[model samples]
Target chain A: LLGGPSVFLFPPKPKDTLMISRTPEVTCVVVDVSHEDPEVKFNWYVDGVEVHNKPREEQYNSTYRVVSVLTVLHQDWLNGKEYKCKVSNKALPAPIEKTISKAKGQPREPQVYTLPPSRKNQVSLTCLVKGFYPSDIAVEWESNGQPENNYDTTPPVLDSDGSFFLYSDLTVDKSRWQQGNVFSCSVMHEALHNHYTQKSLSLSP
Target chain B: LLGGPSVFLFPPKPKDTLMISRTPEVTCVVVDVSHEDPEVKFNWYVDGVEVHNKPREEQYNSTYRVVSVLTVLHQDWLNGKEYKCKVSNKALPAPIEKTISKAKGQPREPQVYTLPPSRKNQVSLTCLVKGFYPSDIAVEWESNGQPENNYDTTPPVLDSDGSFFLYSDLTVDKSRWQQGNVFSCSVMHEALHNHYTQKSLSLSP
Candidate 1:
């Protein structure tokens, strides 16, 4: 009735195996394999979830990749999540696996200004400022630390070579321009994450 | 006629004459008075030149009232020119004599922006400034230290309390963000004669 070995004649044996190192600790990951090897396969994952599995030009399933460079938000790699990479060969017994860690920097900050002194009677004042990149900026005025109705010139114009320069003028009653009067100017920037930079001066008219 | 000296008048004896004081100082003289009791009259003149009259609003014709006010302009009122004032009692007289001096403090000096250190691509930069009465203001961006492009969100919306908070973000690139590059934000008070105030900082990724 039974062929060859009976019941549980030979028992299975446990053995040790080889281990593969993980990916390098860097933002960019490069994967290059010879196309000649048709049986070989490559698989990438984030937190154990399979993501990419094709040639560089044809790969489109992964949210993070060489083409879609990682920004500060995308590098959420170390949130207790595992990023795994596996390579398999049909001729081999099993696949090789690797894992990596995540890292990030700090947030940005802002700037500010105060009022300067001015004269009495018909008081006139001017404001000047500088030192920013990507040039988008805003300027405003305040009186007695409170916003006041005012007028300004057209927005600044950048030079042909790409630089900024502008000027504006204001006139107020000399009595209001004197002691205890406060004037302020503020600058706004987006690259700094909508941070404000300000400056102010007390008027002595 | 020649009626012989009416025989006789014993030489009429001359009566004692009253002595009147005479001052070298300029004096008022009535030339020809026109319009009787004219409300307006020329009060003074320099070197026979008519000068301003009292009640500047009123006008009159005829005699001029020569007064010291007209001699004021000459170096030597008595030697340089004859000063006089004409009053119109009823008739017109020779032009009134008077002198006038130039009034001081008529012109004003032009306002200018004396920025701390403004330039393109320079480590030290400042904002373009302008002054506006009432304080409504707008600022713009630049390239190569000259105004060219305008920053978006300019003329920022004011807060309900009438105060405005504005700012700009410095451009961050691999080199600058990684190494912590420094930039400055500037604000100009439109009411303070376009006065520019600045603040600086370092931006990082």
Candidate 2:
């Protein structure tokens, strides 16, 4: 609990580092209270986008315990993708901006898959990823030193290791896979600066 | 190695001798095991090389089943390279060894936690247990002779820690949670054969 008017977010230790997608549901509680302050208000957001839900509140001895819930998709929890719980009271410093985000750990080698042993013209490939969050990530298959298409992605899936699981599907020619062609699953995430969890396969006849 | 009864399987089989030849290509001679003993671990060695891999790498359905994998390259084997698995469960005699790969552990330890406190008239308490191998543990509240089986201790919950987490919730009047009331939380673990981890909470309110 805060001595004066302040904001506190649960499960976020040291006010900055928090882990997301490790549990089924998470609650962000604000337990700083006021005796003379009137109409203490709170607002919640993810990636700066407002979320809709009222904090369940209780009061005793003029003190308040307000709680809010933050929902996240594992595959979409991009590292440091901000979640802000703003608190306001005229008697305190500017509305307290208490933000939490999924800390970046590591990205597994991107998943690589394609037509198993044989295929040709109009062939398809996929670049899949999981366990990386702050969902501001984009993964794709590449060819000839350039980004290629028939590119597609799937929604986030929960993981046991506190990471999200997701997959990418791409389309290319059969020759690109077995006959002297090169392709890779490239990922872009906040945690890694200009780095990608790329898994490439180059099988040449 | 059980004065009790246990079935040790080879190649992930069920209490039987199993043998099959797989084309060696970076083959891993894995011998993993779970045990009724705490000292169950592996001494994995790739032939002609130092101890390369470690065991107890994976466990499932609680810590009762532990697994280990030892890696070996095919080219090494043809060069008189042979992989070996040495089982290390201290309670057992000389280290157990298998020339091939994955084995599974006994229950390391049982977890017990209780949130016991005051209430107006009805005092409800809950005990949380986890990470115990071999899910056949018993949880209940014992009081006044016949066991108080009313505790809502959910089935052992599988945890990512390679063990189970179980909880027991008991509700009783404040009067019963006092001196001479004799309330206790008792647990029976199969690994600890004939032993119980029963703690008494028979103090006055």
Candidate 3:
């Protein structure tokens, strides 16, 4: 195995094991895996069977374990599904199991901000996202579905209040802030199980 | 033979090289073995002869041809000593050589900065070193020649005007900072041949 399975057993009853939040959308899942023993070899199962070697599209894919945040791409697929995470630590005497439920419907939309559009010299543009946890977030800048360049991403800055904020800056040629150029900022939260929330705003001088 | 004999040459010329800077605090030697039609195996010689495979104390204890930087500890020992660096691309007919005169004394005394001398309750003390160059600088804090804890050092930050700055912060312990403890900040510039320009300061109240 590339990595060993979690060998610890779950508590007698299910509790809030993980929490997730995004810029525009927020979802929380409660997992229960009290059935399996600590020793039995077990793997993560999205709905029922083993999820080992399964692709994102084929699996229910609801659990978010990594420290960084993840954005959900397919929000509809996660609705009403039981996301399960099972661990079998051979070092113990029995297998361990846990399960969590996914919420239905799309998350709230993100708030968008835009720079004033210009026509001549180069113009700098920036987009900011705040109030998210587990910072594995990515921002994509697009001009009508095609990726644009000359944009720099700043590291997330944490505030005394414990919230996280990030910003992205881009320099556009020809001061086209008002030329019908569309810019969007998307945020991913690990808790949302790969779900993404995006907001688009136009530039106007 | 432990090391071989090689010729020592100086450039732009030897006398002017040492005169370029008043204080011969540290020496930087850039080895160029990639010359066109390379001759002579390029090897660095400190005082005399090749420095290869020699114990460190004998040849300033340096092991690599790119002898990063040298700091002057004893001024008298370095006087009249010709720090010769030879480059021999054995495949070539002859090796090119560059030599610089090593001198004693420095323009400024070693300086250091310290944070709140006495620990304060819930207060963070920061030590900053400014007006330096070359980003690959290292700063170390020591108390009585032993490593101290509870401080963080940031990578060198360069200003638009081309000067380097670094800072470290410590959250004072009300019990500790009030006792007039001592701390030192040592700044080492790798571009200056690892020459350390250290400043020691104290904090009170």
Candidate 4:
């Protein structure tokens, strides 16, 4: 259900602009348009500073989409400069405007579970980041406020109506997972209005 | 971005069948597929009983989808028969089969929120039924395991994918509010598999 060529013109459905600072050494901003029908065409601009980039295309459900990313200096994005993903397709008179900034939405608390004795001595924690639009967000695991390591993430998935959900997981030694040590998964999105949602793990069943 | 028709086939996505036996008089089962594409068609069956009703189609995000309901006698469904909704769309090589039995998923415990105290002398309870599919579910109030009445419901909403979410409300008499009478909202859906989720209200902020 993921590849094909399209003759029809469904307007470009742009997702929220996201800025990734995973590595402080480099900053990359990305925007995605799921079900981008008709044609895939876009222009990227960093703080009104013309950005040069090509759109990446994919087909799904008989539809087409483009995921475009633009790399910029770390200090540029941090200074609150703007990043925009402007898309124009045959289906629309005007281009879709997407801002490269944070989005707001609360994350579901981490649903923590004990891995069976045989399954691996680690506990599994699943956190749901849901109902946020304009999709830029980050998920992290924290213990006593210090970032933890070794986590898995499923790519952010769009819902039928265009909202998004991202599932992130972390496994930790069972013995450490027990003993009432509080573990939390944090979600940072612009929709939350300068706030973030941190889902805590319930140490007990 | 909602009116254009699709020129391609993304297959006729079919959702699971849901059966509800509320009274001896009637039996109802429903299924919904959003972001519905072209070449979408359906046939409903109850206990192998053929139904000639056409699939109802609606447009969302520039595509059409099928939402169909079948009516049958309650006793007939209880007689241990099967119910199915078969879909045929250009997107698939073979017909897509969906059952009208219980759906599979766990409705996380409901989130209960309170209304502003100034809105009225009464306090309101809002419950979110999320992460479940097929949209065939019911929410009710109970006190000490006994069913309580009088609440309003908003139609279920389809997420960006196709899972459904429902918000429900219950208003309490301000005078009865001070005394802590435990209240719980119970969700009846096939996904819970003989298991229903009852979320207790967090009495305060």
In the order shown, the candidates' Cα RMSDs to the true structure are 36.5, 20.7, 28.6, 23.6
Instruction: Please give the distance, in angstroms, between residue B95's alpha carbon in candidate 2 and its true position after superposition.
Output: 13
For A52-93, candidate 1 gives per-residue lDDT tens digits of 332221221221111111111122432324555554544334
Model 1 chain A TM-score equals 0.36
Best by lDDT: 2
Per residue, candidate 3 scores C-alpha lDDT tens digits across A1-205 of: 2122221111110011222322211111112212332223335554564443220101112211111011222332234445455544433345444543443334432222332222247765555455455343455576777766455444444433354455555667654555758766555554444345555656533
Return the DockQ of model 3. 0.01
- Model 1 per-residue lDDT at B205: 33
Q: Please say which candidate is ahead in lDDT: 2 or 4.
A: 2
* All DockQ scores: 0.01, 0.02, 0.01, 0.02
| Per-residue lDDT of model 2, residues B64-87, tens digit only | 333444434433532334556565
Ranking by lDDT: 2, 4, 3, 1
By summed lDDT, which 10 consecutive residues of candidate 2 chain B come out lowest?
Answer: B10-19
lDDT by residue (B1-205, candidate 3, tens digit) is 1133222122121112223353332222322223332233345455675443321111112222222223322332234455555544443355445565532334222223332222215444545455554333445566556644445444343344455454555544555445665555655542343365544444444
The most accurate candidate by TM-score is 4
TM-score of chain A of each: 0.36, 0.42, 0.41, 0.48
Q: Which parts of model 1 have CA positions greater than 4 angstroms off?
A: A1-120, A159-161, A191-194, B1-205
When 3 and 4 are scored with TM-score, the better candidate is 4
